[PDB]
């Protein structure tokens, strides 16, 4: 159909734009960190780990766009287990790194003397290693359960759950909703909220206007990070909830278009995290002004 092919090339262009923006931004952030910033703070290590997780998450977007274009999985079960394992393991490392930077700023502001020992770069490497090792507890069962199956004349890359498969599939979707959306958004919201409530007392700048301006800038950065996480990760999770609990058509072009839009939002979080964490980073802005002048 002409409308179906127009929707397919629109979804492919959206995946291509999100993948290009995410890869370009994350490679630029890692290149600026490695060559210029040299990873001397805890925050620099968290931004580097976040950019690596986001580049690895957005690396699976050409595979998903080719899967939607050809309506099949042409890559084999090794690439099935690898694309579909990188997608889950890097969703968890990216979201846990976002949560950990929220916790790091909460420790930096609300427990500042205890931040002088907790926010060392060595403990930042240890915490990041613990995050990438904690996510391996998801990323290994996903590597195992990933299969290629014949379905409607095509090959679909899916997850072969143990029996009963519907039960473990619903349990896996619930656990991804809880530990990759709900618990991270509660920790991020509580940490940033307590940090902002502490910062209303902190004398950021001399004078009323300058201090209120800097506090408004920090509050705006917090609100754009939290809102970007919500409007990028809530649509895919609510769509998975509706797909599991509500008997939708599952073949309507509007339904699959809203599904791929939710997936492109979930990857647009990874695409925007260079903007929300490195473009708005005042240390990185200082380094950029030092490079320009």
């Amino acid at each position: 159909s002409a409308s179906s092919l127009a929707l397919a090339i629109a979804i492919t262009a959206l995946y291509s734009a999100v993948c290009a923006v995410g890869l370009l931004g994350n490679v630029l952030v890692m290149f600026g960190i490695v060559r210029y910033t040299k990873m001397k703070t805890a925050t620099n290590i968290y931004i580097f780990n976040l950019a690596l997780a986001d580049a690895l998450a957005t690396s699976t977007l050409p595979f998903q766009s080719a899967k939607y274009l050809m309506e099949t999985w042409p890559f084999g079960e090794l690439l099935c287990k690898a694309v579909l394992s990188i997608d889950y393991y890097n969703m968890f490392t990216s979201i846990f790194t976002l949560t950990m930077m929220s916790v790091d700023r909460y420790i930096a502001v609300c427990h500042p003397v205890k931040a002088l020992d907790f926010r060392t770069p060595a403990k930042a490497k240890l915490i990041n290693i613990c995050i990438w090792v904690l996510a391996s507890g998801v990323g290994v069962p996903i590597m195992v359960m990933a299969v290629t199956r014949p379905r409607d004349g095509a090959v679909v890359c899916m997850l072969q759950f143990p029996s009963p498969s519907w039960y473990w599939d619903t349990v896996t979707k619930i656990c991804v909703f809880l530990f990759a959306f709900v618990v991270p958004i509660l920790i991020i919201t509580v940490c940033y909220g307590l940090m902002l409530l502490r910062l209303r007392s902190v004398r950021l700048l001399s004078g009323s206007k300058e201090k209120d301006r800097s506090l408004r800038r920090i509050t705006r950065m917090v609100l754009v990070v939290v809102g970007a996480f919500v409007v990028c990760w809530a649509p895919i999770h609510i769509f998975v909830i509706v797909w599991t609990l509500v008997d939708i058509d599952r073949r309507d072009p509007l339904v699959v278009a809203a599904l791929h839009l939710c997936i492109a939002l979930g990857y647009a979080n990874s695409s925007l995290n260079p903007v929300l964490y490195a473009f708005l980073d005042e240390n990185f802005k200082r380094c950029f002004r030092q490079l320009c002048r």
Partner: peptide, 5 residues
């Protein structure tokens, strides 16, 4: 996420 169901 979401592309594999």
């Amino acid at each position: 996420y979401x592309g594999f169901x």
